[PDB]
Design an enzyme around this catalytic site. Structure first.
Site, short mmCIF file in Angstrom:
data_model
loop_
_atom_site.label_atom_id
_atom_site.label_comp_id
_atom_site.label_asym_id
_atom_site.label_seq_id
_atom_site.Cartn_x
_atom_site.Cartn_y
_atom_site.Cartn_z
N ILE A 10 84.12 0.17 74.94
CA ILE A 10 84.09 1.33 74.11
C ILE A 10 85.45 1.09 72.97
O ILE A 10 85.16 1.58 72.05
CB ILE A 10 84.35 2.50 74.97
CG1 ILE A 10 83.07 2.96 75.74
CG2 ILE A 10 84.86 3.77 74.14
CD1 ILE A 10 83.00 4.20 76.35
N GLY A 11 86.47 0.42 73.59
CA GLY A 11 87.48 0.22 73.08
C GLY A 11 88.90 -0.32 73.61
O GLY A 11 88.69 -0.63 75.02
N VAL A 17 92.08 -1.13 78.96
CA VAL A 17 90.95 -1.25 78.28
C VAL A 17 89.74 -0.38 78.74
O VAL A 17 89.94 -0.02 79.83
CB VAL A 17 90.54 -2.90 77.96
CG1 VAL A 17 90.65 -3.53 79.19
CG2 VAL A 17 89.09 -3.00 77.22
N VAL A 18 88.75 0.23 77.83
CA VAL A 18 87.86 0.97 78.29
C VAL A 18 86.58 0.66 77.88
O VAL A 18 86.35 0.22 77.08
CB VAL A 18 87.91 2.58 77.65
CG1 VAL A 18 87.28 3.51 78.13
CG2 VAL A 18 89.72 3.03 77.78
N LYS A 33 88.24 2.91 82.66
CA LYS A 33 89.56 2.55 82.04
C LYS A 33 90.22 1.60 82.86
O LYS A 33 90.77 2.33 84.09
CB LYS A 33 90.53 3.70 81.52
CG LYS A 33 91.27 3.37 80.62
CD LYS A 33 92.52 4.18 80.92
CE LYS A 33 92.52 5.59 80.21
NZ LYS A 33 93.51 5.83 79.35
N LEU A 74 80.94 10.42 77.12
CA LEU A 74 80.31 11.20 76.16
C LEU A 74 79.96 10.12 74.93
O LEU A 74 80.79 9.04 74.80
CB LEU A 74 81.09 12.22 75.37
CG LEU A 74 81.07 13.74 76.05
CD1 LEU A 74 82.24 13.73 77.19
CD2 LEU A 74 81.28 14.80 75.09
N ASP A 77 82.29 10.09 69.27
CA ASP A 77 84.03 10.59 68.92
C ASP A 77 84.00 11.41 67.35
O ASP A 77 83.11 10.91 66.38
CB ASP A 77 84.90 9.39 68.92
CG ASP A 77 84.87 8.54 67.74
OD1 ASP A 77 84.92 8.63 66.71
OD2 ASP A 77 84.27 7.04 68.03
N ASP A 118 99.11 12.29 72.05
CA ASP A 118 98.55 11.25 71.10
C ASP A 118 97.18 11.60 70.38
O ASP A 118 96.39 10.99 70.45
CB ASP A 118 98.56 9.91 71.84
CG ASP A 118 98.23 8.86 70.74
OD1 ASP A 118 98.69 9.01 69.50
OD2 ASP A 118 97.54 7.72 70.87
N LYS A 120 94.09 12.56 68.29
CA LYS A 120 93.51 11.81 66.99
C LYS A 120 91.99 11.99 67.03
O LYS A 120 91.50 12.24 67.73
CB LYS A 120 94.08 10.23 66.79
CG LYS A 120 93.83 9.32 67.91
CD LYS A 120 94.78 8.31 67.73
CE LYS A 120 94.85 7.41 69.06
NZ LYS A 120 95.85 6.32 69.32
C1 LIG Z 1 80.45 3.54 67.08
N1 LIG Z 1 81.06 2.11 67.87
C2 LIG Z 1 80.24 1.18 67.15
C3 LIG Z 1 82.33 1.86 67.59
C4 LIG Z 1 83.34 2.95 68.19
O1 LIG Z 1 83.50 4.03 67.57
C5 LIG Z 1 83.18 3.19 69.71
O2 LIG Z 1 83.31 4.37 69.92
C6 LIG Z 1 83.12 5.40 71.20
C7 LIG Z 1 81.86 5.12 71.70
C8 LIG Z 1 81.98 5.93 73.05
C9 LIG Z 1 83.04 6.94 73.47
N2 LIG Z 1 83.25 7.70 74.66
C10 LIG Z 1 84.03 7.96 75.44
C11 LIG Z 1 85.45 7.42 75.48
C12 LIG Z 1 86.37 7.91 76.48
N3 LIG Z 1 87.54 7.38 76.30
C13 LIG Z 1 88.32 7.11 75.09
C14 LIG Z 1 88.87 5.85 75.24
C15 LIG Z 1 89.64 5.26 74.17
C16 LIG Z 1 90.21 3.74 74.37
F1 LIG Z 1 91.64 3.90 73.66
F2 LIG Z 1 90.61 3.74 75.65
F3 LIG Z 1 89.34 3.00 73.87
C17 LIG Z 1 89.72 6.07 73.06
C18 LIG Z 1 88.91 7.29 72.89
C19 LIG Z 1 88.42 7.74 74.04
F4 LIG Z 1 87.83 8.86 73.90
N4 LIG Z 1 85.74 8.77 77.38
C20 LIG Z 1 84.49 8.91 77.57
N5 LIG Z 1 83.62 8.52 76.52
C21 LIG Z 1 84.22 7.01 72.76
C22 LIG Z 1 84.05 6.09 71.42
#
Ligand SMILES: CN(C)C[C@@H](O)COc1ccc(Nc2cc(Nc3cc(C(F)(F)F)ccc3F)ncn2)cc1
Length: 277
Positions: A10-11, A17-18, A33, A74, A77, A118, A120
């Site tokens: 996810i990121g 890392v998640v 995470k 979820l 974002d 933080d 955003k």
């Molecule tokens: C569209 N794809 C291609 C690219 C991205 O936008 C990928 O977008 C996505 C896709 C799915 C999700 N769902 C999540 C994310 C999450 N935690 C979380 C962790 C981080 C961090 F910093 F750990 F990574 C940053 C922000 C966060 F919300 N908890 C529950 N669901 C969030 C972003």
């Protein structure tokens, strides 16, 4: 971690890392995470936040001297949603509903002495039902600086729940104009962008500012710009509320609890967004 099967990254986060993972014990889909390396303590205290507008911490696993955090998952974002809406913009009723909900979220954790630190677009999560939720919540202790409160950029160490109101203010304006409010590329650049728009702060509007650790009397003195130019679409109800969210003095900055009764939320409703997953 034998109980979790990775599906996709996810990121990458400030402290771990998640991944999207499936729990083999429950067939449940989750955000997993993994932390890098008094902590298990405050983290195991975080599982107690229960509110519709915050992403649930489901489980804390401490094995092979490493720390995993298991979150409610979820699909989308706010940042991706804004990008997909850039040509036409997010409809005002939906901007308002999302603002109202994050404020309920913020008021709840703040009344339990939990700050986010933080916020955003990237860590605000939405669903098909029209709800939005705070993620990466109480968990602090290229970075983006765009949503950093002025007290933090000046080296205040003992900052308050007011930092989250400031970040939310910046996001509120971004949704309305479809452009980042203060797009700084460094801390000094970030600081000087806020100065150019809201005016260089002094003892008059911010008692004590001149004795913050990183304040310099050599800072350029820019005047304050008219607000109606900052967020042109926004009506006066919205502009008055934005300005109270963007007071320099953290003590004058409106609380989440007070922001909820502001006249802007008179006609608030709960629309459903169109989402492509
Ligand atoms: C569209 N794809 C291609 C690219 C991205 O936008 C990928 O977008 C996505 C896709 C799915 C999700 N769902 C999540 C994310 C999450 N935690 C979380 C962790 C981080 C961090 F910093 F750990 F990574 C940053 C922000 C966060 F919300 N908890 C529950 N669901 C969030 C972003």
């Amino acid at each position: 971690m034998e109980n979790f099967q990775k599906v996709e990254k996810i990121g990458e986060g400030t402290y771990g890392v998640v991944y999207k993972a499936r729990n083999k014990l429950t067939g449940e889909v989750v955000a997993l995470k993994k932390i890098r390396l008094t902590a298990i303590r405050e983290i195991s205290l975080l599982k107690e936040l229960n509110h519709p507008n915050i992403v649930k911490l489901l489980d804390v696993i401490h094995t092979e001297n490493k720390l995993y955090l298991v979150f409610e998952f979820l699909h989308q974002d706010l940042k991706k949603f804004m990008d997909a809406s850039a040509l036409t913009g997010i409809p005002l009723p939906l901007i308002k509903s999302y603002l109202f909900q994050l404020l309920q979220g913020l008021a709840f954790c703040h009344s339990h002495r939990v700050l986010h630190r933080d916020l955003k677009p990237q860590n605000l999560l939405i669903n098909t039902e029209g709800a939005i939720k705070l993620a990466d919540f109480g968990l602090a202790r290229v970075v983006t600086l765009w949503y950093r409160a002025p007290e933090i950029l000046l080296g205040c160490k003992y900052y308050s729940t007011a930092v989250d109101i400031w970040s939310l203010g910046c996001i509120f304006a971004e949704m309305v104009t479809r452009r980042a409010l203060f797009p700084g590329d460094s801390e000094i650049d970030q600081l000087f962008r806020i100065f150019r728009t809201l005016g260089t702060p002094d003892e008059v509007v911010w008692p004590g500012v001149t004795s913050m650790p990183d304040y310099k009397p050599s800072f350029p003195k820019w005047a304050r710009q008219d607000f109606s130019k900052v967020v042109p679409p926004l009506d006066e109800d919205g502009r008055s509320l934005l300005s109270q969210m963007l007071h320099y003095d953290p003590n004058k900055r409106i609380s989440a609890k007070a922001a909820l009764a502001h006249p802007f939320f008179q006609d608030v409703t709960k629309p459903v967004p169109h989402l492509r997953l």
